[PDB]
Design a protein around this ligand. Structure first.
Ligand SMILES: O=C(O)CCc1nc2ccccc2[nH]c1=O
Ligand SMILES: [Mg+2]
Ligand SMILES: [Mg+2]
Ligand SMILES: [Mg+2]
Ligand SMILES: [Mg+2]
Ligand SMILES: [Mg+2]
Ligand SMILES: [Mg+2]
Ligand SMILES: [Mg+2]
Ligand SMILES: [Mg+2]
Length: 712
């Protein structure tokens, strides 16, 4: 037994040592008082945590039975009687205070990254600023048409298209008084105003207030800092660079303020099934908050400029960090009680990520340099909550953690993910439950659709996964989320977020279509990579989110009936080949993700889909796919032979898609010999029995089984 006893707790040594030697020192928290507080919080809050999970099961059994025995009036009457659909509270304004400008004020891209991957976490934090030239040149936003494709070395024709794209962007975002940036000859700062040399004349900006600063001398600036819709744009000037020599004004690059905030994730993008895994995550979270995290490589320093009217100012070189804790469901054996019962992981995350975040509020040799929150807040995204009482519980959890940490009450702020149906239909009350802590709400596709399928599992066969994206329930869910946030005063106070673009290489399509989200009044939305953050930033220059929000406020665009419109497939709406395609699709999604999760403990990566399109999904992809297949199985759309045959067809496909990975362990031809293959099979076959369709219990068990076999 490798555990430390503290009150009723038996703490894994690796965790206990991490906290004492790394997390605690520099916080001024007395270590014995901390550990006593951990024991007391776990003892006090565990019963309610369990009570809430029981209530999920109780409500769902009632819903299963109701469906087992189409009319909307009877259905919502039913949901109301069982306490699933609660009355809408009175109108109110959130009272959350001490929030940084990146959240209250700036609209822009939001990156989410697996905290267990230090290099990715570092790149994400550094992604507050990104190269537009690199993003345009390196992706298909500039088509690889004849002559303009990227080879082993610099293609000037392609670069010239990159340059022109960016010139057009500057014209659109920071218009000159006359002429185009495409005719620029040079830049100078005269009388604290930006002057752009043109061929036949000279010109300032149409709105000189968009001029924000510069580097080097006003005579010949090395860069020119502009602002639009709250976001900075820096024109780098160096006619001696590879591309500067080719440019008419010697422009080297255009740098965009990109990932304004980043979510460091402990939940669905990481595989962490024991104390050693949790410690890897906590240690990286620690390094980020101290500012000394280094990989293979380090965090960027802040950026120095001269204001138009002279005098120096500094801009943050890094993304403001949130941390995403796990939700209320799972336990982890990082801590067990006397009976050997595992402790609630969400409770542990609040205590440990909260402790660690104190370093990000400080700057010394002990706590590293670099401050995360200027206003003294800790930003925690709380996923997978079901309804307002589960939000209230999170409030109580954070309050008790603050007390243990010696922090001011309401220091720990909550990002409310709206990704469960019972939260969706009671969203206003969920926000009201956290009215003095809430700094965001957001929507998604996968997790929310996963819950949609599980909740109405007994209703009938569901439409295909692709179809879900355009279903009435989900479009109302998207608008209702914005409506509730705006009605509660989020504009100027808290983020209203939308979902992830998963197609990592389809940047042209993202740039074309993702603009719909800020057009919808979302002050942020999720991107999979620093490159995608820079490109998505374009949308926020193109759309005035603040103005969109002002025009939406007070509107009620969704009905409860729309929200409750179950995505049931019409009476036999598929051909055999369409059914086959959807089974293969889902089995491939499950296998492609699971094999990396169970075998290598990777919970996010570019996974080729069935059409070889690279997707960067998290564990929610598993929840939707396994629930859909379990549903089709449940209602006789497919057979158990169909499922097994697809898994066996797609498995070697997955193996093939993983050529080029040295640590990869093939699943075919001995399927029942691969723990990953069996995990994937189990997720489908036992899908209908999982609490709310959640995949963690199975995935965690299988990864743990794999670790034990690898050490035997
Ligand atoms: O559709 C959904 O609900 C899930 C969204 C999502 N979150 C991610 C977080 C970190 C890394 C990759 C991710 N991919 C994703 O699709
Ligand atoms: Mg300077
Ligand atoms: Mg620090
Ligand atoms: Mg989710
Ligand atoms: Mg939408
Ligand atoms: Mg409302
Ligand atoms: Mg505008
Ligand atoms: Mg805004
Ligand atoms: Mg059940």
């Amino acid at each position: 037994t490798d555990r430390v006893s503290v009150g009723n707790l038996r703490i894994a040594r690796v965790l206990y040592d991490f906290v004492n030697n790394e997390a605690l020192p520099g916080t001024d928290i007395d270590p014995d008082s901390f550990w006593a507080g951990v024991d007391k919080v776990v003892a006090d809050l565990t019963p309610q945590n369990q009570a809430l999970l029981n209530a999920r099961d109780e409500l769902q059994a009632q819903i299963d039975k109701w469906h087992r025995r189409i009319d909307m009036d009877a259905y919502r009457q039913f949901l109301t009687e069982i306490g699933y659909l609660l009355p809408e509270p009175d109108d109110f304004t959130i009272t959350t205070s001490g929030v940084d400008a990146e959240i209250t004020t700036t609209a822009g891209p939001q990156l989410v990254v697996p905290v267990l991957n230090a290099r990715f976490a570092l790149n994400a934090a550094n992604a507050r600023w990104g190269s537009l030239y690199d993003a345009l040149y390196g992706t298909d936003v500039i088509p690889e048409t004849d002559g303009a494709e990227k080879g082993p070395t610099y293609n000037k024709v392609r670069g010239d298209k990159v340059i022109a794209y960016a010139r057009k962007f500057l014209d659109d975002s920071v218009p000159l008084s006359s002429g185009s940036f495409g005719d620029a000859t040079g830049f100078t700062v005269q009388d604290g105003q930006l002057v752009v040399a043109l061929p036949d004349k000279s010109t300032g900006l149409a709105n000189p207030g968009q001029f924000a600063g510069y580097t080097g001398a006003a005579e010949s600036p090395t860069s020119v800092l502009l602002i639009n819709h709250g976001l900075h744009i820096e024109i780098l000037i160096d006619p001696e660079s590879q591309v500067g020599t080719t440019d008419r004004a010697g422009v080297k690059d255009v740098i965009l303020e990109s990932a304004i905030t980043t979510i460091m994730d402990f939940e669905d993008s990481v595989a962490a099934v024991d104390a050693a895994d949790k410690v890897l995550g906590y240690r990286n979270w620690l390094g980020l908050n101290k500012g000394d995290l280094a990989a293979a490589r380090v965090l960027n320093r802040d950026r120095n400029y001269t204001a138009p009217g002279g005098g120096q100012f500094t801009l943050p070189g890094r993304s403001l960090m949130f941390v995403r804790n796990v939700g209320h469901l799972m336990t982890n054996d990082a801590i067990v009680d006397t009976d050997g019962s595992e402790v609630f992981e969400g409770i542990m995350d609040a205590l440990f990520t909260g402790l660690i975040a104190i370093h990000g509020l400080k700057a010394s040799d002990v706590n590293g340099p670099l401050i995360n929150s200027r206003t003294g807040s800790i930003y925690i995204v709380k996923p997978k909550m079901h309804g307002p009482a589960e939000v209230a519980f999170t409030c109580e959890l954070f309050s008790r953690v603050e007390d243990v940490l010696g922090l001011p009450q309401n220091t720990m702020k909550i990002g409310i993910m709206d990704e469960e149906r019972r939260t969706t239909v009671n969203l206003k009350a969920c926000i009201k439950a956290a009215a003095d802590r809430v700094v965001f709400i957001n929507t998604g596709f996968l997790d929310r659709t996963g819950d949609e399928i599980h909740t109405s599992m007994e209703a009938g066969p569901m439409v295909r996964k692709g179809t879900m994206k355009s279903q009435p329930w989900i479009l109302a869910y998207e608008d209702h989320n914005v409506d509730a946030g705006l009605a509660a005063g989020f504009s100027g106070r808290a983020q209203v977020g939308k979902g992830m673009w998963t197609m990592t290489e389809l940047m042209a399509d993202m740039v074309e279509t993702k603009i719909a989200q800020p057009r919808a009044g979302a002050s942020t939305a999720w991107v999979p990579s620093p490159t995608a953050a820079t490109l998505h930033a374009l949308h926020y220059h193109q759309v005035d989110v603040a103005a969109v929000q002002q025009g939406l406020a007070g509107k009620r665009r969704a009905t409860i009936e729309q929200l409750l419109t179950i995505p049931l497939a019409k009476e036999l709406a598929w051909a055999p080949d369409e059914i086959r395609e959807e089974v293969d699709n889902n089995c491939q999604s499950i296998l492609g993700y699971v094999v990396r999760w169970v075998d290598q403990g990777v919970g996010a990566s570019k996974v080729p889909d069935i059409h070889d399109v690279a997707l960067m999904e998290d564990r929610a992809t598993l929840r939707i796919s396994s629930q859909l297949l379990a549903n089709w199985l449940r209602h006789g759309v497919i057979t158990s032979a169909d499922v097994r045959a697809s898994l066996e067809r797609m498995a070697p496909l997955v193996d093939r898609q993983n050529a080029g990975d040295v640590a990869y362990r093939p699943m075919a031809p001995n399927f029942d010999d691969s723990i990953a293959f069996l995990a994937a099979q189990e997720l489908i076959l036992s899908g209908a029995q999982q609490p709310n369709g959640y995949t963690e219990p199975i995935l965690h068990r299988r990864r743990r089984e794999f670790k034990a076999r690898a050490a035997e």
